[PDB]
RNA sequence: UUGGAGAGUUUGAUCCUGGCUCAGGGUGAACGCUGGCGGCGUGCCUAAGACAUGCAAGUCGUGCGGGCCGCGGGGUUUUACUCCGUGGUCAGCGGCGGACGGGUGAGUAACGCGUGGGUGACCUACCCGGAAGAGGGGGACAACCCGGGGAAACUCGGGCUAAUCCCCCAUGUGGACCCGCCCCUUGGGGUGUGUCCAAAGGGCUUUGCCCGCUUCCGGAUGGGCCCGCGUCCCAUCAGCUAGUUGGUGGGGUAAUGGCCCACCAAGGCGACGACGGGUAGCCGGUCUGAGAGGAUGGCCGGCCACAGGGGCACUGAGACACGGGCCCCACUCCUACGGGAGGCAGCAGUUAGGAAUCUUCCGCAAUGGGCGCAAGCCUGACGGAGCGACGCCGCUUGGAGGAAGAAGCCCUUCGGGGUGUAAACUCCUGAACCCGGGACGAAACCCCCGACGAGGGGACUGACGGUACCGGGGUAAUAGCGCCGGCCAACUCCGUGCCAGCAGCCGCGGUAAUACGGAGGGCGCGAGCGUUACCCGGAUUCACUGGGCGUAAAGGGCGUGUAGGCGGCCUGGGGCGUCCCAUGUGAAAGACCACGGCUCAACCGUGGGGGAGCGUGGGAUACGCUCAGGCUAGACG
């Protein structure tokens, strides 16, 4: 059960914008356009101050939330990520953002991540030559990630490019419309994360 | 519910019998020069031996003497006899000991 | 290599055997302090050398008798008794602290 | 009778072999003496087989009668080529 | 320096002490609600209870002789009888394997295991290497035939006979024992005289090649014994011991040894905890922990121990021998009541016990092992499948669009908010499912050429499995459980009324319940979620790290001094502790880093690095220790 449920009311509970369904939540409504107060009878309600664990775990979910990934997996990555040499924070979302799924979504093949994933269990993805279903694969660097063959003639992915002439891709990856393909060229740097949450308080919680 | 796997026990019969024969023929040879000595026979003592130290290091050649055991039973038998010699010195044959 | 110890010999009761007291020395597992222990290790005197308060070099051997696996190796200082006077008085305590009757 | 034989250490359906030295009597997965290299039946890598005759031959010097299947891969390692 | 989070609770209120409780991680789990898929792993933790059935070690006719059933062929004019070759089948004699592999943890607190050592106290089948030899003579017993006993299991007796079975004799390369000497130095090596000891044959491509045989030195591997250190709880267990400790001789073993016996002696151990009791296989590792430490030792690997309970030995390189033997005991079964037959702690399974732990499956293809010249036989070792959400890891139940927002359900200050982009509806993709193709693992032994060497050529052979996997087509296609007073993320209505009930702790509930029960809504996690149990953690709450004792629990009623601990200044020696260096060891697997393998990961491979402890050698000498010399500040006169 990898979630899979009502979206937008994420987006709500945690007051900051979440981009789950790429266009749509773009156009007056993911829904924090005008309504920002979480679900709920008691979203018009007062909040009262926020225990430390309380901000530490929200700011924990706004993170897994947002790559929409089951704790299961968030924390095996987060363990792994403590034996790496490194910083224990940055070097997370390194992996995180070595997802074949999620590689899928900044080289813009699919609107969005969940789009993303479908997009590669249902084997539209191309990694070095041989198609790959699982998005759990990390993307090492210098990999070409591309479409299949097969389904570069989709009335979707085809849509989805049209729209890549006038975006700038993520300065870590490169892509060749003209050929549906892309490269992963190194792994992205804190500096180079737009993300807006606060690593430290998601470390800080693994700690309890 | 049988087992011809048995028949090593079937054999084994045939062995026990077998060495028995052997290292009981030692015991009373043995026990026979030794009283030899006693008396001061230096002439059969050594006689009956030399029998001895012949089926000794036969039944090594065998399985029915260790190996090293057929040499304790021989340095445990001349050296008993020797000494014993000395209540009546001389050896007549001059077999079984080196001098 | 042949294990060798140093000790004193404690017992001459024995024909032919004396017994070595070997202290030994060593930090503690755990509180690190140096702790002294020490064992009596059975020696074998062929002709009857060593004496009581004598200080002996023992060496492995062949076994000799059941608990009596070393040979005594050279002297070290003859004459020193202070040393078995402390096994002798410990001994003697020995005799108290029991439930058979204390007295003075 | 020391012998020369492979052991199993890859996985149900993951065979990866040891071509090592031990005593006949001690089992396929047991102390050995001296490993001597590897074999693996898949072949997933271009290195899919090692040995270093250099003790190889020590052994069958000493005494080893090797595998019927052991022996193949000592010969394609050139343990016994006289050139 | 890649590493350490706390909260609730004694009061009217405060601070300290202090106990209780909780959040975390983990499991060979079990129970509840729910339950789709795959990979890998794992699955009696309790009665080491009892166990039907089947299978779990055999294999050689290139060691020897035959029985049965049958075929072919010879000597016979013919007949009967007979001779050779042969297929099948059976067992026997003999060799090798049964002492491995598989199980299990009862016992065991011990040189049992760990670790480092010793063996001038040792053995070691088959393998490897090197040296020497196989000369002559004779014997026994099964099978088989004849007879007797018994209900049975099985047994007795008489007779024949082969062999690589057995025994004699000679040769002796050599080897053994006594005695002497030389060297060494515990039973090590050289040597001299005396004495004693060898051996089988079989097959072919049969004048040579293969297998096997004998003695001896060496090797390799495997193992016996022995020593230092390490090894749980109780002192409401304090003295234990008579072969007991030692000695001489003798026995016995491969061999040291009170191991055993005889005699001699009077010893040996204990608070550095003897003895007694309780408990428990040990370890590599594994769990937790910031670490120290605590806990653990199933799966895998190493060592040990038992194979219904106890005893014993045989045979053998090896056993005191799980599917060999002798005896006693308990049990179960046959019984003509004399007397017998049994041992799943092998695989599967049965039953019992229990909270609880699987299929009487496939295969011998692979890897290994036994026997064989080989073809090959055996191989519930093993490789595979199956069953169990028991664990872990991967996967799905869809994606994009879509109202100022439907209905229904809840809340309302009745105006409206909420569930909610959620639905509906639009399009797109397409697990399942369908057709086709379809695997690595597997290349050897063998055979041929070559010299049965090297080298080269040829053949056979898969349980998994038509499975993985690739191609093509193809349906929008499971969700549940805990929780929402504080700790602790999540708040309203109603029902109820110290009731019914919750509850880890504090507590909640007597008509206004964010704490009971449903509901909407919310949080958390997701084929799972909870629960109970148990380990470590929080707990520096047994305190080495890292605690305390005026009143919180805690100074002994006081002194005396035993053992022990601890100890002043200067000089030197030794260098035991102590520190540095080099070296051997510290198996493998695991952990760690790195690279790679299976679409990822779990899982796996390959390579690197690290280490405490101990052995040996070398060094240092402050400090501790020790010996020596000297001092006077402690002490004493
Ligand atoms: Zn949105």
């Given at each position: 059960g990898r979630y899979i449920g009502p979206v937008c009311r994420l987006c709500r509970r945690e007051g900051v914008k979440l981009y789950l369904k790429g266009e749509r939540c773009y156009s007056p409504k993911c829904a924090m356009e005008r309504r920002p107060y979480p679900p709920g009878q008691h979203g018009q309600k007062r909040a009262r101050r926020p225990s430390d664990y309380a901000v530490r775990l929200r700011e924990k979910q706004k993170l897994r939330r947002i790559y929409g990934i089951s704790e299961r997996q968030f924390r095996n990555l987060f363990e792994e990520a403590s034996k790496k040499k490194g910083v224990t924070g940055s070097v997370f979302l390194g992996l995180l953002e070595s997802r074949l799924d999620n590689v899928v979504?900044?080289?813009?093949?699919?609107?969005?991540?969940?789009?993303?994933?479908?997009l590669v269990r249902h084997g539209h993805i191309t990694?070095?030559?041989?198609?790959?279903?699982?998005?759990?694969?990390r993307v090492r660097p210098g990999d070409e990630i591309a479409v299949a063959?097969?389904?570069?003639?989709?009335?979707?992915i085809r849509q989805?490019?049209?729209?890549?002439?006038?975006?700038?891709?993520?300065?870590?990856?490169s892509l060749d419309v003209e050929g549906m393909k892309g490269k992963f060229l190194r792994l992205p740097d804190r500096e180079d994360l737009a993300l807006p949450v606060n690593e430290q308080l998601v470390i800080e919680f693994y700690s309890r | 519910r049988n087992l011809s796997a048995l028949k090593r026990h079937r054999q084994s019969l045939k062995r026990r019998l077998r060495n028995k024969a052997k290292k009981s023929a030692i015991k009373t040879l043995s026990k026979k020069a030794v009283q030899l000595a006693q008396e001061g026979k230096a002439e059969e003592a050594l006689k009956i031996m030399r029998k001895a130290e012949s089926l000794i290091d036969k039944a090594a050649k065998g399985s029915t003497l260790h190996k090293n055991a057929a040499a304790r039973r021989k340095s445990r038998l001349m050296r008993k006899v020797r000494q014993l010699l000395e209540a009546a010195g001389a050896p007549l044959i001059g077999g079984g000991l080196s001098a | 290599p042949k294990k060798v110890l140093?000790?004193?010999?404690?017992?001459?009761?024995?024909?032919?055997?004396?017994?070595?007291?070997?202290?030994r020395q060593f930090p503690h597992p755990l509180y690190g302090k140096v702790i002294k222990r020490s064992k009596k290790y059975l020696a074998h005197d062929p002709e009857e050398k060593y004496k009581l308060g004598d200080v002996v070099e023992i060496i492995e051997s062949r076994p000799i008798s059941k608990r009596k696996r070393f040979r005594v190796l050279r002297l070290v200082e003859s004459g020193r008794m202070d040393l078995v006077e402390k096994?002798?008085?410990?001994?003697?305590?020995?005799?108290?602290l029991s439930k058979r009757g204390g007295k003075a | 009778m020391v012998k020369i034989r492979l052991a199993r250490f890859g996985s149900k359906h993951n065979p990866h072999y040891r071509i090592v030295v031990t005593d006949a009597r001690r089992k396929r997965d047991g102390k050995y003496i001296e490993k001597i290299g590897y074999y693996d039946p898949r072949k997933t890598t271009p290195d899919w087989l090692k040995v270093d005759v250099e003790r190889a031959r020590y052994w069958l010097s000493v005494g080893a009668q090797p595998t019927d299947t052991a022996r193949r891969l000592l010969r394609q390692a050139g343990v016994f080529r006289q050139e």
């Amino acid at each position: 059960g990898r979630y899979i449920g009502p979206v937008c009311r994420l987006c709500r509970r945690e007051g900051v914008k979440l981009y789950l369904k790429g266009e749509r939540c773009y156009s007056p409504k993911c829904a924090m356009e005008r309504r920002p107060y979480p679900p709920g009878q008691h979203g018009q309600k007062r909040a009262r101050r926020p225990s430390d664990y309380a901000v530490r775990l929200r700011e924990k979910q706004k993170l897994r939330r947002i790559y929409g990934i089951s704790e299961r997996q968030f924390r095996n990555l987060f363990e792994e990520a403590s034996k790496k040499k490194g910083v224990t924070g940055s070097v997370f979302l390194g992996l995180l953002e070595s997802r074949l799924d999620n590689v899928v979504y900044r080289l813009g093949f699919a609107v969005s991540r969940r789009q993303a994933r479908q997009l590669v269990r249902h084997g539209h993805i191309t990694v070095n030559g041989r198609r790959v279903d699982l998005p759990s694969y990390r993307v090492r660097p210098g990999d070409e990630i591309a479409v299949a063959e097969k389904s570069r003639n989709l009335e979707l992915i085809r849509q989805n490019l049209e729209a890549m002439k006038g975006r700038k891709v993520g300065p870590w990856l490169s892509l060749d419309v003209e050929g549906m393909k892309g490269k992963f060229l190194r792994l992205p740097d804190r500096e180079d994360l737009a993300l807006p949450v606060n690593e430290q308080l998601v470390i800080e919680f693994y700690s309890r | 519910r049988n087992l011809s796997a048995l028949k090593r026990h079937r054999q084994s019969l045939k062995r026990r019998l077998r060495n028995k024969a052997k290292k009981s023929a030692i015991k009373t040879l043995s026990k026979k020069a030794v009283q030899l000595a006693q008396e001061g026979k230096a002439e059969e003592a050594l006689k009956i031996m030399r029998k001895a130290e012949s089926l000794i290091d036969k039944a090594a050649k065998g399985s029915t003497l260790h190996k090293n055991a057929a040499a304790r039973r021989k340095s445990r038998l001349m050296r008993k006899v020797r000494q014993l010699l000395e209540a009546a010195g001389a050896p007549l044959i001059g077999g079984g000991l080196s001098a | 290599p042949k294990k060798v110890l140093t000790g004193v010999v404690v017992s001459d009761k024995m024909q032919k055997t004396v017994t070595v007291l070997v202290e030994r020395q060593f930090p503690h597992p755990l509180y690190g302090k140096v702790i002294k222990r020490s064992k009596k290790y059975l020696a074998h005197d062929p002709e009857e050398k060593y004496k009581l308060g004598d200080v002996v070099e023992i060496i492995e051997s062949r076994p000799i008798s059941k608990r009596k696996r070393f040979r005594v190796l050279r002297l070290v200082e003859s004459g020193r008794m202070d040393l078995v006077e402390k096994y002798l008085i410990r001994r003697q305590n020995y005799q108290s602290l029991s439930k058979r009757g204390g007295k003075a | 009778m020391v012998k020369i034989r492979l052991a199993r250490f890859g996985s149900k359906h993951n065979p990866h072999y040891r071509i090592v030295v031990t005593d006949a009597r001690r089992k396929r997965d047991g102390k050995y003496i001296e490993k001597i290299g590897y074999y693996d039946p898949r072949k997933t890598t271009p290195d899919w087989l090692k040995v270093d005759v250099e003790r190889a031959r020590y052994w069958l010097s000493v005494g080893a009668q090797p595998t019927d299947t052991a022996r193949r891969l000592l010969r394609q390692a050139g343990v016994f080529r006289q050139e």
